[PDB]
Design a protein around this nucleic acid. Structure first.
Lengths: 511, 683, 754
RNA sequence: AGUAGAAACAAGGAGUUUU
RNA sequence: UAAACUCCUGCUUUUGCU
């Protein structure tokens, strides 16, 4: 039975003019459909409709990118412009420890200079960064002269390093009733992000992440013996895959981003108070098979007390570069470029020397950002699963051995390039890298703006394929779909590039 | 004994242990999962986070007794703090390092008997054999298929009932004890636990795991058996299938049921095919059932099935001496009769020329659904003791009995004409026409039969025209038994003869089995039925039949073009285009093949209409035997499921769509291959 | 040259390479601060699309709730929850006329699931909202706190193990005004030391009484906690997910029991199962629409989606459905299904945490609770949030917000789907009586529709007839995110469809790796995920021995257990080589302690140690055959071979995995932030009890396999067994019958302690 | 500063001592 | 009162007490 509290609120739980449930319970039993559907469509408005406009090939307007300043570098290390301070073949004196692998690299770099700021940090205290590098350049030499043999290295808290690592810049949690009358006690800045625009550089990051290299970047585990025919046909399919994924520069960024986020996550777990030092190491096997240990630069971890899932670990990234910041300064708004050295290069005609920089930058990851850099090796899966599935669309075509079909002709049939000479088709080995270089940058620059873009940029992608396949498509208000995308193109360089590809796609899918 | 003291020793402490006095049946039933610490929303980060702590693992307090805190290396391998929420302490993974190199070594040789099902899989795989890749497309079927049911096919609660006995018997609470088959199998399992070791309770609920019949919907492109279901990914795929024969005992009960369903996909393939007398022999040499071919299984099999015995007698092997009629097993226990060729006028005054059996004969009617004894006279049913599982099975058994007795009451009960002309060029027989009519509706037949009073003595009750039992009165001659009909008969094998029409004739010429006697039930396979030709395309689906046929023309076009030019009859008698002809209109039977063979003969004489569009488009039609027709043969109707979706004579269609610029063929949507540019170029 | 990869759709069709446009590789978006701004932007949005129903005021609640259905018809394309009761009943009076006898059949199993279910069915699931502590307690502790509220109340009436008397007294709990709940607060003591002569402090927890009202319990009984939908993908914004209360899900379990039982008897809801049956149902009806495929029809499909699907429902027409789909059913059964659409139609969402304020002068932060929002100097807020409070400041009751229109996430599905498919039932041609007719499927909110009619004018007249049918019931299809085209190309919860052959690419691969539950049992579930997704989620052969190859590469990074043949160093390398040189079975040693990787794609279904068993020399597996196992803590059947790994199709899914008990299946560390709360007393009292509850559960054998359901009084419960332990040892045994008298003596000695 | 994006982090939390 | 040192915690830090 429904008692004298719930049965009374069993009356407001009804449609209006039904003031008793037991009357309403004895209303539906005497129900039969009179035909009140079209009786209500006679009563509804004729304006409530879902009229289809046709979706012609002159219908899709291109996406309008936002307008503002050019977009800054936001990846938590450098991408196209790091520098491989390399000791080659570590057997002895290059050991398994990363911090002693650091010391031998710049001992093998001969030309060092005095630190002078090339471009200043436009809104941060510039001499704190040049005193930061002078600390660690003296602090990493505080272990190669002293044989007490440490494993990791702790910075000590200066005045310049407390600044760039957010030391006690947090407002302390007062009670609200302690100081109500503060004239500017506001709710936080909950505003929109200030929009940026598309600059020329994030395209040039993607071109370099597409192209090959002379190193072999992934060496990975083994599996059991292929004494089945599926395991012989898949391992021939897979050792064709890593013939262009070992030598691809976007796997330099995977095996960095795995390593930086691994070392940050482990050093955040032990050293929750002091400022550790972390080098940035990638180990590159070569063409022939002699190994190498590259160094890219250092990282000074901040205070890491991660009480939520997305509290931020501040840190400072020192990276060795060769690219002049004065060449294109619409990119490095967040950096403080020093100038530390010089080397000799080898020209095909002669030889040349040219200086060396150091890009210093205050950063931050959450725990989530530096977990999802450790599963960045799943860029390889998502980039393999298409050329896996690009055997399914070629399954019914040939009905035979067909890994023997792709990599054995250079029948460059897949359109990738844009050029003055048109679109430039590519081979599958070129395509296996672009789908990898797209899949890396979906994790380095991964924002919410990329999620909410490609959800309703897919629904604009599907119907242009329905239009090219002459399926006679039709929307309901496509114009309102375009203000669902351009809502999400706000300020990060990758999403403003994906739309800029997509506008370059809609002008090639409709000719 | 000694456990009970500490059950008392805690009590003279404070009221901490004396709220456990107050803790209910329910509260301990709920606090057994009492988690102050919630379930991890993202455990993948917590494992990557806590493994960098110096002590991630909680191991219980016995580690402080049995494992040193000092190893040879220099690390400290457990910690003296307690876990939050237990007396359990926190350890490092160097504890697990220590235990697996320096821990106690116990030699229980019956630890494989604990996890016996997993070692069966290794036994299936290491002793299994692979076949080569059959590059065929995936047309997967997504069905709820069983995973590892195991022994006796026992209910999921009843699986826990026999486990509840063998863990400790005093907690069973089973209102239903057991059946007789469970009474022996639990006695064997009873001593096996002492045979394991002094054993935990975990050996009990792994024996529970091999009894759980899990049924999980999975896309099964191939066989669906609890020996093939655990692989399911090794075998099936994109461009390809992997033939896979795992080791172990190939069973005895339902390799029959594996063979029956594979047989019917060759007989029904043959009835559309132009030559059942050659193709069913020819498809025996390519079909494999679990690697073991159909040629090897049929010989050692004394199981009588209609399509199987056709596959037996095609190869030169015997069948039994039991004649069939409407797909039932009929055994002559007594009596004899002679044939007499007589014509009867039905209720629609339709002449049916029937073979009158002049002589009293006593039969045993055994069906898939019924078991009966028919006492039959000249054009008359004397007596029918009949049994079956339900009254609809009794409905089938009486209707088959009322037709075969050939009485004038059944003949004058026909309402309308009979044109069950089956899918074929030939015709049929008046016996099988009279079955289907009254198997559709026999209510008027039930009233014209005759109703008589009965005597119920030993549970021998009757049946009424409204298909209801009655102890008072009943239909004439038919008595329905409450018990089962005693059969116990065995039949010797006799060499029998067969024709092209699959009409199985004995020494005397009596037609025993036929494609009309083939039952229409299409069962669920068990052993992967793998055909080496193209006769899996109908199993795939009517849609696929149309797709994969125009696929096959493309790759082998240079085989086809020479067979187009030189020998079209060899091109037409291919068994791969006979897959198409199951979908051909029967009203347009031979009409289409009439025109295409001439339209090709038009194209061979003109030498300049070598077009490559219509040659692809109409070549599957000429596999049928052609006929003379009037000039109206141009609405080319092609069956898909239900609707006869058309193809035009000129241009494209929704069914057959060809794009000249793309040079790709769109067949009911799907893109089929890519034809080479050469037969567009030449003439 | 300029390189873009999104131009490879110019050759590959879009549904064949659609997985490139799933950025599921990067992190998902998380909410940082609260859901307070997100809840109020849903209580606003519900009371905007329903803004014309009559505003009642609840008698026992004081809630100013809205009563929006069977109101004025919508007269624009903006979404609207004004559902028509004479068309909700009508459009599923046609549910039984297509599939005959669904409702009274499906109640009959539901009348049997109600007659065998314990309370233990509702103690499993997500974290819930208790009303005792006003916090997301997990599903055991919230149930096992509200029950001894009734015991600390006068009327328990619930301890009979079944949940229906537990669902009798939650109605009866709304009668007793004085609801004397338990409060514990933390204090300090003062003890001495005899060895060092020092006098230090000691922490302990006190006890406090507390009472409620009927305008204070009923709100907390009808309170939905509003979280934020963390890690949703495909939305720039976020949304509120609702956590139902403790009393509510007891009634809601029966309501989705019935409503799932409908959809398994229907054939257009792919939701009551996983994704593989959904691909069957999807490709079923593209062929079911080629049944009446005539010589000239036109069949356009609709790749639908429903916008604002959760705000535009109303549990008042859920009550209209489950009053109708329980026609001529017993009085108690129609009543017990009816409480849950009642106490959703009076539900009162909390407003989450609040807001964090910032001083730009004093450099101070603070945060208010969400309850203070009834009384705040409104210039504390920026111009966006200030708009959101003023539109629901009339709706704040007791720190909650009266939200009677609309459902929201994490609360209940599968009955609004029954509604959503019943409109799709109505397009069956026997019901249209016109040339156009439609069918399709209905997921949670993403639907797909296929309509056909002999020309474009018919389809245009068939699409809007559907759209104006769904408007009668508050189903508002997304005009943004949907489109039409011919058959063979659509999607349905991202199950894309290209001319017949689906590419799944939904719940792509958030995991493929070490989802650490244990050290072995995340390899046994590790290689199971590569196994199961070769079947379910369709990854091919080479990516299966890539996702295995790399699975091990971070199986060995989290658990540090590299080979000895790699001379690299970590916390141990040396004594591994003791296993290497001594065991003649070098290449059969187990990989959770530095072994080879014998796995490949012939043998994922085989577990780890049963793979590496017919090679090992007797020492190692004999060192693994020790059943003592300080690293196992032999689990319960609900937790034996169960890991909770989330897909993108549902909120949670447990999937099993063939894991042999081994020394690597250990339980990870409990979080320790509860030690610094003022809620310490929920642990130090109860940490002692599963030390000793499982000392009882030694004395029953089946207690660690089956739920023991008998009398109360655990202390009295084993001594009833102990005296039937006594006589069957007395009548026959190996032990002496004088030691029997020692077993006798303990029994009354227990009772001598009162 | 920085991370970040519609609200957050920039340690929280307990003790003692000195205008 | 401003400075330093002392212990716990890293999903439970979302909030009920004295």
């Amino acid at each position: 039975e429904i008692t004298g509290t719930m049965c009374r609120l069993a009356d407001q739980s009804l449609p209006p003019n039904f003031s008793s449930l037991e009357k309403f319970r004895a209303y539906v039993d005497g129900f039969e459909p009179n035909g009140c559907i079209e009786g209500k469509l006679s009563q509804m408005s004729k304006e409530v409709n879902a009229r289809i406009e046709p979706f012609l090939k002159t219908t899709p307007r291109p996406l309008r990118l936002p307008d503002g300043p050019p977009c800054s570098q936001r990846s938590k290390f450098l991408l196209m412009d790091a520098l491989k301070l390399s000791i080659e073949d570590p057997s002895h004196e290059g050991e398994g420890i990363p911090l002693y692998d650091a010391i031998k690299c710049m001992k093998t770099f001969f030309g060092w200079k005095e630190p002078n700021i090339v471009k200043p940090h436009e809104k941060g205290i510039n001499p704190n960064y040049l005193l930061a590098w002078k600390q660690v350049l003296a602090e990493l030499q505080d272990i190669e002269n002293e044989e007490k043999i440490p494993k990791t290295k702790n910075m000590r808290k200066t005045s310049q390093l407390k600044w760039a690592l957010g030391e006690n810049m947090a407002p302390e949690k007062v009670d609200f009733e302690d100081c109500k009358d503060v004239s500017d006690l506001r709710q936080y800045d909950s505003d929109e992000p200030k929009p940026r625009s598309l600059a020329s550089w994030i395209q040039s990051e993607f071109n370099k992440a597409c192209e090959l290299t002379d190193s072999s970047w992934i060496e990975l585990d083994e599996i059991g013996e292929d004494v089945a025919p599926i395991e012989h046909i898949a391992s021939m399919r897979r050792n064709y895959f890593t013939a262009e994924v070992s030598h691809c520069r976007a796997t330099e960024y995977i095996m960095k981003g795995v390593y930086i986020n691994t070392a940050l996550l482990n050093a955040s777990c032990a050293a929750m108070d002091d400022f550790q030092l972390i080098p940035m190491i990638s180990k590159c096997r070569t063409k022939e098979g002699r190994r190498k240990t590259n160094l890219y630069g250092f990282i000074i971890k901040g205070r890491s007390h991660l009480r939520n899932d997305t509290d931020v670990v501040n840190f400072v990234s020192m990276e060795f570069s060769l690219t002049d910041p004065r060449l294109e300064p619409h990119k490095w708004e967040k950096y403080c470029v020093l100038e530390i050295g010089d080397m000799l290069l080898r020209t095909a005609i002669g030889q040349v020397s040219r200086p060396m920089f150091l890009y210093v930058r205050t950063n931050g990851t959450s725990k989530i950002k530096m977990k999802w850099g450790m599963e960045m090796r799943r860029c390889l899966l998502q980039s393999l699963q298409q050329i896996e599935s690009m055997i399914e669309a070629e399954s019914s075509v040939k009905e035979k051995d067909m890994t023997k079909e792709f990599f054995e002709n250079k029948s460059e049939t897949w359109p990738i390039g844009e050029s003055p000479k048109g679109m430039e088709e590519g081979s599958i080995g070129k395509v296996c890298r672009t789908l990898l270089a797209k899949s890396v940058f979906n994790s380095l620059y991964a924002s919410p703006q990329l999620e909410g873009f490609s959800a309703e940029s897919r629904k604009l992608l599907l119907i242009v394929q329905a239009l090219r396949d002459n399926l006679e498509p039709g929307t309901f208000d496509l114009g309102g779909l375009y203000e669902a995308i351009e809502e999400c193109l706000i300020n990060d360089p990758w999403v403003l590039l994906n739309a800029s590809w997509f506008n370059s796609f809609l002008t090639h899918a409709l000719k | 004994m000694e456990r009970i003291k500490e059950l008392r020793d805690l009590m003279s402490q404070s009221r901490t242990r004396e709220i456990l006095t107050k803790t209910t049946v329910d509260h301990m039933a709920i606090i057994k999962k009492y988690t102050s610490g919630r379930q991890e929303k993202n455990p993948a980060l917590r494992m990557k986070w806590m493994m960098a702590m110096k002590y991630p693992i909680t191991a219980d307090k016995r580690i402080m007794e049995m494992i040193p805190e000092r190893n040879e290396q220099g690390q400290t391998l457990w910690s003296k703090t307690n876990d939050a929420g237990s007396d359990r302490v926190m350890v490092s993974p160097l504890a697990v390092t220590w235990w697996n190199r320096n821990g106690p070594t116990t030699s229980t040789v019956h630890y494989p008997k604990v996890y016996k099902t997993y070692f069966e899989k290794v036994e299936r795989l290491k002793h299994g054999t692979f076949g080569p890749v059959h590059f065929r497309n995936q047309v997967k079927i997504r069905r709820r298929v069983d995973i590892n049911p195991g022994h006796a096919d026992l209910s999921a609660k009843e699986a826990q009932d026999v486990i509840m006995e063998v863990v400790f018997p005093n907690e069973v609470g089973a209102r239903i004890l057991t059946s007789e088959s469970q009474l022996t199998i639990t006695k064997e399992k009873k001593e096996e636990l002492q045979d394991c070791k002094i054993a935990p309770l975990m050996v009990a609920y792994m024996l529970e795991r091999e009894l759980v019949r899990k049924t999980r919907f999975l896309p099964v492109a191939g066989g669906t058996s609890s020996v093939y279901i655990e692989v399911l990914h090794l075998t099936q795929g994109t461009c390809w299938e992997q033939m896979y024969t795992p080791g172990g005992e190939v069973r005895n009960d339902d390799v029959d049921q594996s063979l029956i369903i594979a047989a019917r996909n060759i007989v029904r393939r043959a009835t559309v095919s132009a030559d059942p007398l050659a193709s069913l022999l020819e498809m025996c040499h390519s079909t494999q059932i679990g690697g073991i071919r159909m040629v090897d299984i049929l010989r050692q099999n004394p199981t009588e099935e209609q399509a199987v015995d056709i596959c037996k007698a095609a190869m030169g092997l015997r069948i039994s001496s039991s004649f069939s009629f409407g797909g039932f097993t009929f055994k002559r226990t007594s009596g004899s009769s002679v044939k007499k060729e007589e014509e009867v006028l039905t209720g629609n005054l339709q002449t049916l020329k029937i073979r009158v059996h002049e002589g009293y004969e006593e039969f045993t009617m055994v069906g898939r659904r019924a078991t009966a004894i028919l006492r039959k006279a000249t054009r008359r049913l004397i007596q029918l003791i009949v049994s079956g599982r339900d009254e609809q099975s009794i409905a089938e058994a009486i209707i088959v009995a009322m037709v075969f007795s050939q009485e004038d009451c059944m003949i004058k009960a026909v309402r309308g004409d009979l044109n069950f002309v089956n899918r074929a060029n030939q015709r049929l027989n008046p016996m099988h026409q009279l079955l289907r009519h009254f198997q559709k509706d026999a209510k008027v037949l039930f009233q014209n039969w005759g109703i008589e009073p009965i005597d119920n003595v030993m549970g021998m009750i009757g049946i009424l025209p409204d298909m209801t039992p009655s102890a008072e009165m009943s239909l004439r001659g038919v008595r329905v038994s409450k018990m089962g009909v005693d059969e116990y008969s065995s039949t010797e094998r006799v060499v029998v003869s067969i024709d092209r029409f699959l009409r199985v004739r004995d020494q005397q010429g009596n037609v025993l089995l036929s494609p009309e006697e083939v039952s229409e039930t299409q069962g669920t396979e068990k052993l992967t039925i793998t055909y080496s030709s193209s006769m899996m395309w109908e199993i795939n689906g009517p849609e696929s039949v149309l797709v994969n046929t125009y696929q096959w023309i493309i790759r082998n076009w240079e085989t086809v073009k020479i067979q187009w030019s030189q020998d079209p009859t060899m091109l037409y008698n291919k068994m791969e285009f006979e897959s198409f002809q199951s979908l051909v209109p029967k009203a347009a039977r031979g009409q289409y093949s009439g025109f295409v063979r001439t339209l090709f003969q038009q194209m061979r004489d003109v030498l300049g209409t070598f077009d490559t569009v219509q040659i692809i488009k109409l070549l599957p039609f000429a596999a049928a035997p052609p006929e003379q027709s009037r000039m109206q043969f141009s609405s080319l109707t092609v069956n898909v499921r239900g609707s006869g979706m058309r193809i035009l004579v000129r241009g494209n269609s929704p069914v057959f769509n060809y794009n000249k610029a793309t040079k790709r063929l769109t067949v009911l949507g799907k893109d089929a291959g890519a034809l080479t540019e050469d037969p567009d170029e030449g003439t | 040259m300029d390189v873009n990869p999104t131009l490879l759709f110019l050759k590959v069709p879009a549904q064949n390479a659609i997985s490139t446009t799933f950025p599921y590789t990067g992190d998902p978006p998380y909410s940082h601060g609260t859901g307070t701004g997100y809840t109020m932007d849903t209580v606003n949005r519900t009371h905007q699309y329903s803004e014309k129903g009559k505003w009642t005021t609840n008698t026992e609640t004081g809630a100013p709730q809205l009563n929006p259905i069977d109101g004025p018809l919508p007269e624009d394309n903006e979404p609207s929850g004004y559902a028509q009761t004479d068309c909700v009943l009508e459009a599923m009076a046609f549910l039984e006329k297509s599939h005959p006898g669904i409702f009274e059949n499906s109640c009959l199993e539901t009348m049997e699931i109600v007659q065998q279910t314990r309370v233990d069915k509702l103690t499993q699931g997500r974290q819930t909202y208790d009303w005792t502590l006003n916090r997301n307690q997990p599903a055991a502790t919230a149930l096992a706190n509200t029950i001894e509220v009734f015991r600390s109340n006068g009327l328990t009436a619930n301890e009979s193990g079944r949940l229906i008397d537990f669902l009798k007294d939650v109605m009866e709990s709304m009668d007793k005004g004085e609801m004397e709940i338990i409060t514990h607060f933390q204090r300090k003591r003062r003890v001495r030391d005899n060895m060092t002569k020092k006098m230090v402090t000691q922490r302990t927890i006190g006890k406090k009484k507390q009472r409620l009202n009927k305008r204070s319990y009923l709100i907390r009984a009808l309170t939905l906690n509003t979280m934020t939908k963390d890690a949703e993908r495909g939305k720039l914004k976020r949304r509120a997910i609702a956590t139902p209360g403790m009393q509510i899900r007891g009634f809601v379990y029966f309501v989705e029991t019935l409503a799932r039982s409908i959809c398994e008897k229907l054939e257009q809801s792919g939701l009551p199962v996983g994704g593989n049956e959904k691909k069957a149902k999807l490709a079923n009806v593209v062929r079911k629409m080629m049944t009446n495929s005539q010589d000239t029809e036109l069949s356009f499909t609709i790749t639908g989606d429903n916008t604002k699907w959760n705000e535009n429902q109303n549990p008042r027409m859920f009550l209209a459905m489950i009053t109708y789909i329980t026609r001529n059913q017993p009085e108690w059964f129609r009543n017990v299904l009816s409480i849950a659409p009642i106490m959703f139609s009076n539900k009162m969402a909390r407003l989450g945490k609040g807001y964090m304020f910032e001083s730009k002068s004093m450099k101070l932060r603070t945060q208010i609770p969400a309850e203070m929002l009834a009384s705040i100097d409104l210039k504390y807020f920026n111009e966006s949030t200030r708009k959101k409070i003023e539109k629901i400041r009339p709706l704040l009751i007791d720190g909650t917000a009266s939200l009677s229109p609309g459902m929201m996430m994490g609360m209940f599905n599968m009955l609004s789907t029954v509604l959503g498919v019943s409109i799709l039932n109505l397009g069956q041609k026997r019901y249209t009586k016109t040339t156009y007719w439609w069918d399709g499927l209905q997921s949670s909110d993403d639907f797909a529709l296929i309509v056909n009619a002999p020309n474009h004018e018919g389809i245009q007249a068939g699409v809007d007839r559907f759209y104006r049918t769904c408007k009668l019931v508050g189903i508002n299809m997304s005009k943004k995110k949907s489109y039409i085209n011919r058959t063979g190309t659509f999607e349905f919860t991202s199950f894309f469809y290209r001319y017949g052959f689906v590419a799944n690419f939904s719940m792509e691969l958030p995991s493929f790796g070490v989802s650490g539950i244990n050290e072995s049992a995340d390899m046994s579930i590790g290689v199971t995920v590569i196994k199961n997704n070769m079947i379910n989620n369709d990854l091919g052969p080479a990516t299966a021995q890539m996702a295995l190859q790399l699975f091990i590469k971070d199986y060995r990074y989290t658990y540090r257990c590299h080979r000895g043949d790699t001379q690299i160093q970590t916390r141990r390398s040396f004594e591994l080589k003791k296993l290497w040189e001594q065991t003649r079975s070098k290449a059969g040693l187990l990989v959770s302690d530095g072994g080879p990787n014998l796995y490949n794609i012939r043998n994922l279904h085989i577990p780890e140690v049963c793979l590496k068993w017919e090679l090992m020399d007797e020492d190692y597996q004999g060192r693994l055959c020790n059943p003592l196992n300080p690293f196992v803590s032999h689990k319960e059947i609900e937790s034996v071979n169960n890991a909770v790994v989330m897909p993108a199709h549902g909120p949670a899914k447990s999937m099993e995995y063939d894991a042999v008990a081994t020394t690597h299946s250990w339980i990870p560390k409990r979080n320790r932030s509860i030690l610094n709360t003022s809620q310490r007393g929920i642990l130090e009292d109860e940490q002692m009890y599963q030390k000793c509850c499982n000392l009882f559960e030694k004395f029953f054998p089946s207690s660690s396999y089956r739920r023991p359901v008998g009398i109360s009084s655990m202390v009295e419960a084993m001594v009833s067994r102990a005296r039937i332990d006594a006589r069957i040892d007395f009548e026959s045994g190996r032990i002496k019958k004088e030691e029997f008298a020692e077993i006798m003596k303990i029994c009354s000695t227990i009772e001598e302690l009162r």
